[PDB]
Design an enzyme around this catalytic site. Sequence first.
Site, PDB file in Angstrom:
ATOM      1  N   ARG A   1       4.755   6.229   4.391  1.00 22.60           N
ATOM      2  CA  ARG A   1       4.791   6.426   2.952  1.00 22.60           C
ATOM      3  C   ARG A   1       5.937   5.591   2.408  1.00 22.60           C
ATOM      4  O   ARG A   1       7.011   5.586   2.999  1.00 22.60           O
ATOM      5  CB  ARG A   1       5.000   7.940   2.696  1.00 22.60           C
ATOM      6  CG  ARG A   1       4.781   8.392   1.270  1.00 22.60           C
ATOM      7  CD  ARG A   1       4.054   9.767   1.191  1.00 22.60           C
ATOM      8  NE  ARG A   1       3.856  10.198  -0.215  1.00 22.60           N
ATOM      9  CZ  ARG A   1       2.709  10.637  -0.763  1.00 22.60           C
ATOM     10  NH1 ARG A   1       1.580  10.744  -0.050  1.00 22.60           N
ATOM     11  NH2 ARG A   1       2.692  10.950  -2.063  1.00 22.60           N
TER      12      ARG A   1
ATOM     13  N   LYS B   1       0.924  -1.140   0.000  1.00 21.25           N
ATOM     14  CA  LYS B   1       0.000   0.000   0.000  1.00 21.25           C
ATOM     15  C   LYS B   1       0.969   1.196   0.000  1.00 21.25           C
ATOM     16  O   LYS B   1       1.849   1.292   0.855  1.00 21.25           O
ATOM     17  CB  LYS B   1      -0.885  -0.009   1.241  1.00 21.25           C
ATOM     18  CG  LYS B   1      -1.811   1.179   1.315  1.00 21.25           C
ATOM     19  CD  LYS B   1      -2.799   1.037   2.458  1.00 21.25           C
ATOM     20  CE  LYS B   1      -3.892   2.078   2.359  1.00 21.25           C
ATOM     21  NZ  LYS B   1      -4.854   1.969   3.486  1.00 21.25           N
ATOM     22  N   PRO B   2       0.839   2.120  -0.967  1.00 20.91           N
ATOM     23  CA  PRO B   2       1.754   3.265  -1.028  1.00 20.91           C
ATOM     24  C   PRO B   2       1.769   4.278   0.123  1.00 20.91           C
ATOM     25  O   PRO B   2       2.836   4.799   0.469  1.00 20.91           O
ATOM     26  CB  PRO B   2       1.391   3.898  -2.362  1.00 20.91           C
ATOM     27  CG  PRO B   2      -0.057   3.726  -2.388  1.00 20.91           C
ATOM     28  CD  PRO B   2      -0.243   2.283  -1.950  1.00 20.91           C
TER      29      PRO B   2
ATOM     30  N   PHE C   1      -9.726   6.741   5.364  1.00 22.64           N
ATOM     31  CA  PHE C   1      -8.929   7.896   5.768  1.00 22.64           C
ATOM     32  C   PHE C   1      -8.672   8.706   4.479  1.00 22.64           C
ATOM     33  O   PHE C   1      -8.135   8.204   3.495  1.00 22.64           O
ATOM     34  CB  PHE C   1      -7.608   7.470   6.394  1.00 22.64           C
ATOM     35  CG  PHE C   1      -6.852   8.617   6.983  1.00 22.64           C
ATOM     36  CD1 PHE C   1      -6.029   9.399   6.188  1.00 22.64           C
ATOM     37  CD2 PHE C   1      -6.995   8.935   8.313  1.00 22.64           C
ATOM     38  CE1 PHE C   1      -5.352  10.496   6.727  1.00 22.64           C
ATOM     39  CE2 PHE C   1      -6.319  10.037   8.863  1.00 22.64           C
ATOM     40  CZ  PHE C   1      -5.502  10.805   8.061  1.00 22.64           C
ATOM     41  N   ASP C   2      -9.094   9.957   4.483  1.00 24.61           N
ATOM     42  CA  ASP C   2      -8.964  10.792   3.317  1.00 24.61           C
ATOM     43  C   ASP C   2      -7.680  11.636   3.274  1.00 24.61           C
ATOM     44  O   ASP C   2      -6.928  11.589   2.306  1.00 24.61           O
ATOM     45  CB  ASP C   2     -10.196  11.690   3.271  1.00 24.61           C
ATOM     46  CG  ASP C   2     -10.547  12.112   1.883  1.00 24.61           C
ATOM     47  OD1 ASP C   2     -10.586  11.242   0.990  1.00 24.61           O
ATOM     48  OD2 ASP C   2     -10.774  13.317   1.665  1.00 24.61           O
TER      49      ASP C   2
END
Lengths: 124, 124
Positions: free
Chosen positions: A85, A41-42, A120-121
């Site tokens: 990240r 997941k980036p 989560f935005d």
Amino acid sequence: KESAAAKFERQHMDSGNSPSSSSNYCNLMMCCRKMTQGKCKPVNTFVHESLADVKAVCSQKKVTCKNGQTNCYQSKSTMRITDCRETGSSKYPNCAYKTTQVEKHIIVACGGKPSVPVHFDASV
Amino acid sequence: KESAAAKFERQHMDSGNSPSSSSNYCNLMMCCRKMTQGKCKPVNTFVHESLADVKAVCSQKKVTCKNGQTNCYQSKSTMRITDCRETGSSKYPNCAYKTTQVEKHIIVACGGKPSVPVHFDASV
Ligand SMILES: Nc1nc2c(ncn2[C@@H]2O[C@H](COP(=O)(O)O[C@@H]3[C@H](O)[C@@H](CO)O[C@H]3n3ccc(=O)[nH]c3=O)[C@@H](O)[C@H]2O)c(=O)[nH]1
């Protein structure tokens, strides 16, 4: 299958000079919470506030989501969050993450009834 | 299936915890390294030396295994390790571990050809 030598490595090896350093958190957490299954997941954010405070965001400031939808909510207070990240060289199955600890407002998408966080935005 | 809410919790919630929390190392590692699948592994030791150094132990001091087995070897030097032990309140699916860093000699059971570490026996 997994060889006995590979299993020993999995269960007992963690070479490093400061294995428990905060900089390793994302690597361990993304792995533990299964966000490195078949791909990395980036980007992903962890919130270190009680679930009660995060759920309450669904009844706070209503905002527009990054995707156009209007079922997003922003927290009235800032929260302790960790941004994870992928690094430049991160490549499945060798996912690598940079850990960034910050204090920001969170924006989550809410759904269901009663209303609870479902995505989560962003953070501001 | 996993609900949208439960998925949000898995991906994003880590209440009462922080990246700088070293005592939480065992909890993250036992989870990430799959030793909490379907049951809680009681005790597990992680070695922080390089793999080449751990493999070299298979050609060191032959000793009787402390746990029930044979073909054990003791490291000639001490090694940095982290001992992870289930807490008294640990109970699957809620496994919990106490983290302890220390430097001791390790005893591993070797097998295969070339001889390599296949089981962790004990630290002395
Ligand atoms: N994604 C991930 N990261 C991990 C894991 N265990 C430890 N880490 C982290 O990985 C960092 C160092 O990685 P490394 O020095 O490349 O060591 C890796 C890792 O500890 C182990 C299991 O993935 O394989 C190692 N690995 C991985 C690829 C490779 O080419 N060589 C190699 O030794 C450490 O800072 C630590 O935070 C794990 O199971 N998964």
